[PDB]
Design a protein around this ligand. Structure first.
Ligand SMILES: CCCCCCCCCCCCCCCCCC(=O)OC[C@H](COP(=O)([O-])OCC(O)COP(=O)([O-])OC[C@@H](COC(=O)CCCCCCCCCCCCCCCCC)OC(=O)CCCCCCCCCCCCCCCCC)OC(=O)CCCCCCCCCCCCCCCCC
Ligand SMILES: CCCCCCCCCCCCCCCCCC(=O)OC[C@H](COP(=O)([O-])OCC[N+](C)(C)C)OC(=O)CCCCCCCCCCCCCCCCC
Ligand SMILES: CCCCCCCCCCCCCC(=O)SCCNC(=O)CCNC(=O)[C@@H](O)C(C)(C)COP(=O)(O)O
Ligand code: SF4
Ligand code: SF4
Ligand code: SF4
Ligand code: SF4
Ligand code: FES
Ligand SMILES: [K+]
Ligand SMILES: [Zn+2]
Lengths: 380, 113, 263, 96, 126, 176, 208, 114, 95
């Protein structure tokens, strides 16, 4: 016989079959945050369905906004204006900094290193000030929309993003001073959760979960979206497939996100921020209150919403947790017929059982840390 | 030059990649000769396997073979040859060159409804 | 049979002689945009929204009025058909008031909907608009005549179906006004159907006024009991309360009309 | 910023970095909370002529999916795309 | 063989998890929806719809909101044909009633009839 | 276009082996981590003194809802129900009628603040700037039904916060 | 049509059409349709007996190498007699491409589980069991994954209502969370949003 | 009319699987009453099992009763393994739900439902 | 312009007041009925009628884009003033 531990209720239920110190079986029971998001999406318009995507990976809000917006814009056969695309890449990499701070610092907090959590969440508070200045909300911005973004950058925001970005690499340096060469942090991560490249491909892993195993794959490079082919950055590649190389990949992705943010601040073009098709994006309020066509289009976009032509797309981005996909099916109406949400954490938490075999019970919280799991996107 | 690592976790370095690819490609062709000639899988897989086997027999260097086989490392080219061999052995049993087993219903792929 | 062969976008269709271009396109399931045409009123041909290209013909034809000739290829989706629709929609929206939030027609407005479907997305009209004096035609039909697009469905209904001859157009040009010219009260037994066939919010229901809005209404298909005609109706409710009563089309009873008692 | 130079020197020694050059607390260098009003530009469709919507209608150029095969010689075997180009190692910082 | 022969009527009511009160007391209505007579557009009259009988809506004591206890009060299903809707209702054990599609009959339109020599169809104005 | 994190082979001369042995036996990186924690001990903390000090916000901030008025006392809401049509949570419930002077005005304007997702689609759908999501975020209650705002509560929030709401709209309406 | 219109990618369209011909003629036993959308995504609509032979082909063939299962999806379309549309989204990292494999089932016909092809499928089709009721034969551990433990019905079916049939509350008499038939203080307000005017003439269905 | 089976070729194999599922539930009821420390008796839980089996007793399709056996095995797996709590086991006993009006007259008195 | 029912309960600008025998007054027991005492129907009646020399006037509610959509009001009736449908400001042709 062997021990069965029911680690009850982010929130997760775990059914462990242990054989002493070792883990024989790990059965993650989920659905504790299943909210039926993508059934609720079927009864709402495309604009009304957008704020559900803020709340899936709720540390990667504008990235999921971007993925849903790219899906709807692909089905609408329209493209965002260039300044909107540069704002989306800028705030997508700010979002990537947010998520990797959350990932690395809570993964260190669950192992026992509680202090760089507090050090990096002040930087995270400043990036939430950036979200609040651009949209009015600290987390669920509802800002990146199909057609572009909702509102242009306020004056003086890019200077403050520059003042943040100029100092953030020292914050990464002192995080990396606390953890990377620390022998206690290395003993908790170096031989832990080793995934081969073939098993990572076969188990549907994506993002750092592939790149820690040496797979040279990044969707911003291979299948590029808005203006990621115009920014220059490197892709950190692991060598041993463990928790420690995935940690180093996330730290170096924060480095490369700072690099992309500097390039976005220097290459921000002038122009409009919504697509100038007023049958898709709402007109400005000054012309809504002056022009008859603009008032009609405002009325119909905020009550019926735009009709999307019939068809199905699978649109994926390189979200900070991995490949975030939307399989969006439109029937021709102004509401989605079907919206399957592909989250990286779903397949990663499915691979948790293989990743935890032969390890200890204290290694399982490290493996649940290195798979960056937010249960909003896992459960929908 | 005896490459130290493939870079991929769990993918060991092959000592003799040329002889291993020759064995795998001739074994793919031997398995693939058990498929009827009118089957498109046999024609297409004989075509690409003969192309890869001629490239392997033409190039003594390992790195240049990797650049002109155009399939990444030579060890994942070996892994893909093994996958193609396993696939051909399964395609003999499935016999998927046969006609369509059943037509769909008349509005099964009509979208929108 | 004496059916002639015409073409809608290359598709052949056999139509009776005397079939209009609009009806021939209706036989292949294409609905040509319209404002003044109504299939139970006489043909007016004056909103010009139904203008469609016949190929090898250098002039668009009014599809509601033009009979088809044998061998015409009707181009419902060609470039100059769409340009004709956008130009006519631009002229319809030039003087039209920015009233969609305060107008009861919003959400169920033909002008809104086929401005979205067939018009442009913005304005070039840099002038001041006309504003029309409202009329008083009774306690049933609220009249806001700045919204009128002069499609004359009013007048053709009151003349041909209601048999009243009290509505008309006074004036000339852009100052042409639909009304009664005097303080006269349009109280037929069928006077509420001009609320149905007015494509815009110029003629609205005065009892229904401001209370609901069409997207939030649940539509229950039911029967009139106010007489022994058995007029098919829609009871539109909202949050468990009856909002209004519209007609249903039944060709053998109430064709698409209801009496004012029913309404 | 208000730290004395003894504490500032002890702090820079303990971190091993120059901390005053990159302070994590923000001061007068940030943007003003009251800004001048913007004048936002308009898009390319804000034109008074040559601006017909049918010449820029994105949703109406979407087509139904082209049916390649339906059930109602020595041609080359194909892949869904050309094989992916091998990534080049970083000239910036390869860690080699 | 690898195929069995089931001659029974298709019935999935024990698998759908629907409570029995909302199977045997509900009346599904299968119908092409009538055109909104506020509008001349006919694109909402193209498909068949299945709705259910409206149950009680009452006033919320706190706010005056419309409270319901009917789970099927917002369920509207879309079908391409009448027979698909009938098969779906019979498959789920729903007692149904079907209204036939009401198409508008073809009208005889002539603009010249507005100006006849001797018929009553002359318009008195234009 | 890619880099290898952790692909360094350590040097095996006696210098580097002795360096790693001194790091192992003399705990050098642990003293480095203690130095970094000691460095934050002598920094000024980031703590603001709430409630006397407040977190910085923008004029776009989406907080407590309010119904606004014209500069005559007439309420802006003309009952068009665009805000409840666009409301992703269906938090808004509107009933309307002509009032005694024939004006199109609401008799019911309810916002369930516990359904509300605070996304501000109502204020951007509003054609007359009637519903706004104002600047107040400090409106926690002791009971659930105190967050079920009717029209009287929302008009009192408008009359309460209008001096701030109008200046925030003045700062941002050119971006809208 | 330059600034506001999405640019068409004719090269990828031609390549995916050629590869769809390739798949359709290598596997004519199961392939029913092959289509490429106007935004250049390839769909292979297959018979459900060929779930394992098609997906093993695309995973293992040297010109396909679709090693990654991005997503596995069902779609409920109640007007079809095979109402469930099982959707496989596959990623080839070698050829930098995506493919969609679509098949169908009704409530009672089992689909063969594809865990022997992609282990990634293990939870996804398990989700398809929980949300749609599609049984997957030869699945290792097929059970619910997202709903509550005693949950009746399959929620992403389109005849399943938005709010369910039961709701929970704490009952202090039995000292227990209990399930009762759902009563809403405010009914979800159904919006009829569809315009009665045709939006897209390119997608017009031929009439009766 | 030629359909693909799930497990059973006809109704006899299907009744065999129903019968084995009933045997397994009958064996499990005392352990379920014990370890969930339920306030019901073993006889009452076995009567509830018999009620849930007799509720589906009208089905004549082998695939439908195969899916009913599959779902009953899933419920049993959620019961044997402590995945259900006490609340999920007691949801079969609608104890806080007031008894519905059964006859015509009391349904007439309380409301509009048929 | 608030008034009071004979129960002592304030009547809102809608006209809502509970009846005397209505139990739902118990929610205000020990608490208050929140009413707004700035009735918009009384405040727009306090505005003077704008005398203009044109036949058609435009109203946007003031503030330009901060007001309402700009509408055009005809002033041909000398019996009745021309009222803005959005803001309720009313206009009269001075001739
Ligand atoms: C070692 C033992 C403690 C020695 C005193 C000390 O470290 O003073 C801090 C003093 C200033 O440090 P700092 O961090 O650079 O000051 C930044 C402040 O923002 C600059 O200070 P400030 O601008 O905020 O000035 C206002 C501040 C002024 O601060 C003080 O008066 C500090 C307390 C002095 C006692 O006064 C207060 O905030 C009131 C403090 C009341 C409570 C003091 C409790 C003392 C503990 C014993 C009881 O430290 C030094 O000058 C270096 C160490 C000197 C050691 C001397 C040998 C022992
Ligand atoms: C009064 C003050 C008392 C305290 C003083 C120190 C205070 C500050 C402490 C800060 C760090 C606290 C961290 C807590 C966790 C500690 C973890 C840790 O370090 O684990 C022990 C680590 C474990 O190392 P490890 O296991 O991580 O490293 C891997 C080691 N191999 C490869 C072998 C497996 O180190 C030790 O075990 C060292 C023990 C102490 C040795 C002291 C020095 C002896 C030198 C003798 C002379 C040698 C000369 C050369 C040879 C020739 C001889 C003739
Ligand atoms: C504590 C509470 C626990 C509750 C347990 C819930 C378990 C529910 C499992 C449900 C499984 C079924 O209902 S499958 C039964 C369906 N069978 C049929 O439709 C075929 C008819 N079957 C019968 O009549 C069965 O009685 C028999 C025994 C198979 C044959 O009897 P007949 O002969 O006379
Ligand atoms: S008639 Fe139509 S377009 Fe005109 S104001 Fe009313 S809703 Fe708007
Ligand atoms: S009031 Fe209406 S129906 Fe009458 S002419 Fe004007 S737009 Fe046409
Ligand atoms: S902020 Fe959003 S959820 Fe809240 S009332 Fe406005 S539209 Fe509704
Ligand atoms: S959108 Fe504005 S004017 Fe319209 S109902 Fe809502 S608050 Fe009132
Ligand atoms: S519809 Fe033919 S012109 Fe009005
Ligand atoms: K009307
Ligand atoms: Zn005004």
């Amino acid at each position: 016989s062997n021990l069965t531990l029911n680690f009850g209720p982010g929130v997760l239920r775990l059914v462990m079959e242990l054989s002493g110190e070792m883990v024989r079986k790990c059965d993650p029971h989920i659905g504790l945050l299943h909210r039926g998001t993508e059934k609720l999406i079927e009864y709402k318009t495309y604009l009304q369905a957008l704020p559900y995507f803020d709340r899936l990976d709720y540390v990667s809000m504008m990235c999921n906004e971007q993925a849903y917006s790219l899906a709807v814009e692909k089905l609408l056969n329209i493209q965002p204006p260039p300044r909107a695309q540069w704002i989306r890449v800028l705030f997508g990499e700010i979002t990537r900094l947010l998520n990797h701070i959350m990932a690395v610092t809570t993964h260190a907090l669950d192992i026992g290193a509680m202090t760089p959590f507090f050090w990096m969440f002040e930087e995270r508070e400043k990036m939430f000030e950036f979200y609040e200045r651009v949209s009015g909300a600290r987390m669920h911005a509802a800002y990146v929309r199909p057609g572009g973004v909702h509102q242009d950058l306020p004056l003086g925001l890019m200077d403050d993003i520059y003042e943040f970005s100029k100092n953030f690499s020292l914050r990464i340096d002192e995080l990396e001073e606390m953890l990377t060469n620390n022998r206690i942090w290395r003993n908790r991560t170096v031989d832990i959760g080793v995934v081969t490249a073939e098993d990572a491909l076969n188990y549907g892993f994506s993002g750092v979960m592939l790149r820690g195993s040496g797979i040279q794959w990044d969707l911003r490079k291979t299948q590029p979206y808005d203006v990621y082919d115009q920014v220059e950055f490197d892709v950190p590649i692991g060598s041993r497939g463990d928790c420690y190389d995935r940690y180093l990949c996330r730290v170096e992705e924060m480095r490369q996100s700072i690099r992309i943010i500097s390039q976005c601040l220097n290459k921000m073009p002038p122009g409009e921020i919504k697509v100038d098709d007023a049958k898709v994006s709402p007109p400005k309020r000054a012309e809504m209150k002056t022009s008859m066509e603009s008032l009609i289009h405002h009325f119909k976009l905020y009550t019926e919403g735009y009709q999307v032509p019939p068809g199905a797309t699978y649109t994926a981005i390189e979200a900070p947790k991995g490949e975030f996909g939307v399989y969006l099916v439109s029937d021709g109406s102004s509401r989605p017929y079907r919206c399957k949400i592909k989250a990286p954490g779903f397949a990663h938490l499915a691979g948790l059982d293989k990743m935890s075999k032969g390890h200890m019970l204290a290694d399982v919280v490290a493996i649940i840390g290195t798979q960056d799991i937010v249960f909003g996107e896992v459960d929908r | 030059l005896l490459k130290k690592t493939t870079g991929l976790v769990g993918l060991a370095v092959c000592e003799t990649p040329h002889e291993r690819l020759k064995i795998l490609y001739t074994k793919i062709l031997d398995v693939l000769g058990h498929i009827p000639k009118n089957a498109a899988y046999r024609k297409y897989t004989e075509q690409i396997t003969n192309e890869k086997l001629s490239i392997v027999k033409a190039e003594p260097d390992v790195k240049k073979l990797e650049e002109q086989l155009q399939g990444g490392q030579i060890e994942e080219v070996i892994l893909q040859a093994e996958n193609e061999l396993s696939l051909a052995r399964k395609m003999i049993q499935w016999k998927p060159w046969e006609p369509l087993v059943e037509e769909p219903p008349a509005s099964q792929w009509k979208w929108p409804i | 049979s004496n059916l002639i062969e015409v073409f809608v976008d290359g598709q052949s269709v056999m139509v009776e002689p005397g079939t209009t271009v609009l009806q021939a396109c209706e036989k292949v399931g294409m609905q040509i945009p319209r404002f003044c045409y109504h299939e139970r009123l006489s043909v007016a041909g004056n909103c010009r929204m139904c203008l469609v290209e016949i190929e090898k013909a250098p002039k668009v034809v009014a599809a509601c009025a033009m009979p088809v000739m044998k061998g015409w290829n009707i181009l419902t989706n060609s470039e100059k058909t769409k340009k004709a629709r956008e130009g006519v929609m631009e002229f319809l929206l030039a003087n039209h008031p920015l009233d969609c939030p305060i107008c009861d027609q919003g959400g169920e407005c033909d002008l809104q909907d086929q401005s979205m479907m067939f018009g442009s997305d913005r304005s070039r009209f840099l002038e001041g608009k006309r504003a029309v004096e409202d009329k008083n035609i009774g306690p049933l039909v609220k009249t806001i005549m700045t919204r009128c697009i002069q499609c004359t469905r009013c007048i053709r209904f009151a003349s041909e179906i209601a048999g009243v001859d009290d509505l008309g157009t006074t004036g000339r040009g852009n100052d042409m006004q639909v009304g009664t010219y005097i303080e006269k009260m349009f109280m037929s037994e069928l006077s509420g159907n001009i609320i149905d066939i007015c494509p815009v919010g110029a003629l609205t229901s005065k009892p229904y006024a401001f209370t609901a809005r069409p997207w939030e209404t649940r539509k229950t298909e039911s029967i009139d009991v106010m007489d022994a005609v058995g007029s098919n109706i829609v009871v539109s409710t909202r949050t468990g309360e009856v909002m209004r009563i519209l007609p249903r089309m039944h060709e053998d009873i109430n064709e698409e009309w209801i009496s004012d008692k029913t309404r | 910023a208000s730290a004395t130079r003894l504490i500032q020197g002890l702090r820079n020694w303990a971190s091993g970095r120059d901390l005053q050059a990159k302070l994590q607390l923000r001061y007068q260098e940030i943007s003003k909370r009251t800004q001048p009003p913007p004048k936002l530009p308009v898009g390319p469709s804000h034109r008074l002529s040559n601006n017909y919507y049918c010449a820029r209608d994105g949703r109406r150029e979407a087509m139904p999916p082209s049916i390649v095969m339906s059930s109602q010689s020595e041609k080359k075997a194909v892949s869904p795309a050309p094989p992916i180009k091998r990534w080049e190692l970083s000239q910036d910082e390869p860690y080699l | 063989t690898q195929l069995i022969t089931v001659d029974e009527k298709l019935d999935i009511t024990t698998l759908t998890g629907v409570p029995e009160e909302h199977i045997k007391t509900r009346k599904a209505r299968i119908f092409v929806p009538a055109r909104n007579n506020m509008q001349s557009g006919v694109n909402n009259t193209k498909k068949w719809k299945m709705e259910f009988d409206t149950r009680e809506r009452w006033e919320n004591p706190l706010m005056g909101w419309a409270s319901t206890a009917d789970p099927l009060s917002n369920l509207v299903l879309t079908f391409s044909t009448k027979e698909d809707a009938i098969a779906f209702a019979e498959k789920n054990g729903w007692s149904y009633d079907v209204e036939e599609r009401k198409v508008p009959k073809p009208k005889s339109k002539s603009y010249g009839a507005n100006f006849s020599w001797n018929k009553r169809t002359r318009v008195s104005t234009k | 276009t890619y880099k290898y994190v952790n692909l360094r082979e350590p040097s095996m001369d006696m210098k580097s082996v002795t360096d790693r042995a001194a790091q192992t036996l003399l705990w050098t990186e642990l003293i480095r981590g203690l130095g970094m924690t000691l460095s934050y001990l002598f920094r000024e903390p980031a703590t603001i003194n709430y409630p006397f000090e407040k977190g910085p916000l923008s004029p776009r901030f989406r907080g407590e809802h309010a119904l606004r008025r014209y500069p005559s006392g007439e309420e802006r809401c003309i009952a068009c129900k665009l805000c409840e049509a666009v409301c992703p949570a269906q938090a808004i419930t509107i009933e309307a009628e002509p009032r005694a002077d024939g004006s199109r005005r609401t008799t019911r304007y309810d916002i369930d603040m516990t359904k509300c997702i605070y996304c501000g689609f109502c204020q951007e759908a509003c054609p007359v700037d009637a519903i706004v999501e104002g600047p107040n975020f400090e409106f926690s209650t002791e009971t659930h039904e105190e967050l079920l705002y009717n029209k009287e509560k929302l008009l009192n929030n408008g009359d309460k916060w209008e001096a701030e709401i109008a200046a925030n709209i003045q700062a941002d309406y050119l971006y809208r | 049509t330059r600034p506001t219109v999405r640019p068409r990618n004719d090269v990828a369209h031609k390549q995916l059409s050629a590869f769809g011909e390739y798949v359709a003629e290598i596997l004519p036993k199961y392939v029913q349709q092959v289509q490429v959308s106007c935004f250049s995504e390839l769909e292979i609509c297959i018979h459900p007996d060929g779930v394992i032979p098609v997906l093993t082909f695309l995973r293992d063939h040297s010109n396909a190498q679709f090693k990654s299962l991005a997503d596995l999806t069902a779609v409920d379309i109640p007007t079809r007699q095979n109402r469930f549309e099982i959707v496989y989204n596959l990623l080839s990292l070698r050829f930098n491409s995506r493919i969609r494999v679509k098949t169908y089932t009704d409530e009672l016909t089992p689909v063969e589980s594809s865990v022997s092809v992609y282990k990634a499928a293990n939870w996804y089709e398990r989700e398809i069991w929980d949300m749609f009721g599609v049984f997957f034969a030869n699945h290792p551990d097929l059970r619910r994954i997202l709903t509550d433990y005693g949950f009746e019905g399959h929620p992403f079916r389109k005849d399943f209502p938005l709010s369910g049939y039961v709701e929970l509350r704490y009952d202090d008499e039995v000292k227990r969370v209990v399930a009762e038939p759902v009563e809403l203080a405010q009914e979800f307000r159904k919006f009829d949003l569809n315009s009665p005017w045709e939006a897209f003439p390119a997608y017009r269905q031929p009439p009766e | 009319t030629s359909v693909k089976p799930i497990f059973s070729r006809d109704m006899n194999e299907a009744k065999r699987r129903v019968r084995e599922l009933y045997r397994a539930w009958y064996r499990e009821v005392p352990n379920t009453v014990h370890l969930f420390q339920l306030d019901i008796s073993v006889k009452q839980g076995r009567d509830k099992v018999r009620e849930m089996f007799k509720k589906n007793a009208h089905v004549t399709d082998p695939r439908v009763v195969d899916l009913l056996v599959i779902k009953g095995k899933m419920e049993l797996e959620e019961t044997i393994n402590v995945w259900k709590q006490r609340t999920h086991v007691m949801r079969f006993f609608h104890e806080t739900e007031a008894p519905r009006p059964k006859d015509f007259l009391s349904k007439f008195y309380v409301g509009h439902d048929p | 312009g608030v008034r009071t029912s004979p129960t002592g309960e304030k009547v809102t600008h809608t006209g809502q007041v509970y009846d005397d025998e209505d139990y739902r007054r118990v929610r205000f027991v020990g608490r208050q009925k929140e009413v707004n005492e700035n009735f918009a129907i009384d405040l727009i009646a306090e505005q003077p009628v704008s005398q203009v020399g044109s036949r058609v006037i435009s109203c946007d509610g003031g503030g330009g884009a901060l007001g309402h959509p700009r509408v055009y009001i005809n002033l041909d009736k000398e019996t009745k003033t021309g009222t803005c449908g959005y803001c309720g400001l009313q206009f009269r042709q001075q001739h």
